[model samples]
Target: MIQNFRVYYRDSRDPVWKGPAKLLWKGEGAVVIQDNSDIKVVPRRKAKIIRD
Candidate 1:
């Protein structure tokens, strides 16, 4: 449920952001956010399984 992504819009450098987001089951909708504050592009490598 990847809706969108974002990164720290630098002034003279490339966009920097962390990866490994997760799509948590929030009743009816989905959400996406940065997993950390690193600078790289990755996949669901930083997701966690939660029972909610």
Candidate 2:
């Protein structure tokens, strides 16, 4: 069976971290992160997928 996975994101501009998000697989994987005022908005294309 395919197990649940997790991923994290980071900003490529200044090399700063956005946050970690849970991976929801349903033909396509979606990024879900925590809500915070300090969290930077990082696009999916600009961010790299670090699986865990």
Candidate 3:
């Protein structure tokens, strides 16, 4: 199966927030997740990637 990227957080704001998001692009030790009109760049050095 092709893998798509998703996102979540647990610090109260980004916390209680999760998106079964989509993969837009990947580069520079970073992943870009496209959620609707918002594409976010998350650094993998701080965030762990989960296989889903």
Query: Among these predicted structures, which one has the highest lDDT?
Result: 3
Candidate 1 C-alpha lDDT tens digits along 1-52? 5344332222225444423343433232223333455333323332233322
Question: By TM-score, how accurate is candidate 2?
Answer: 0.33
Going through the candidates in the order shown, the clash numbers are: 0, 0, 0
**Which 10 successive residues of model 3 have the least lDDT summed?**
8-17
Residue 14 in candidate 3, Cα distance off native in Å? 3.5
lDDT of 3 at 22: 63
Could you estimate the TM-score for every candidate? 0.19, 0.33, 0.46
Residue-level lDDT of model 2, residues 18-49, one tens digit each, is 56655443232334444354433445554445
Measured by TM-score, the strongest candidate is 3
Error of 1 at 52 (Å): 1.3
> Who is ahead in TM-score, 1 or 3?
3
The residue-by-residue lDDT of candidate 3 on 1-52, one tens digit each, is 3465455423235535455566556567776666568776766453445566
Clash number for candidate 3: 0
Positional deviation of residue 5's Cα in model 1 after best superposition, in angstroms = 20
Ranking by TM-score: 3, 2, 1
Whole-model Cα lDDT of every candidate shown, in order: 0.33, 0.48, 0.55
Q: Which pairs clash in the backbone of model 3?
A: none
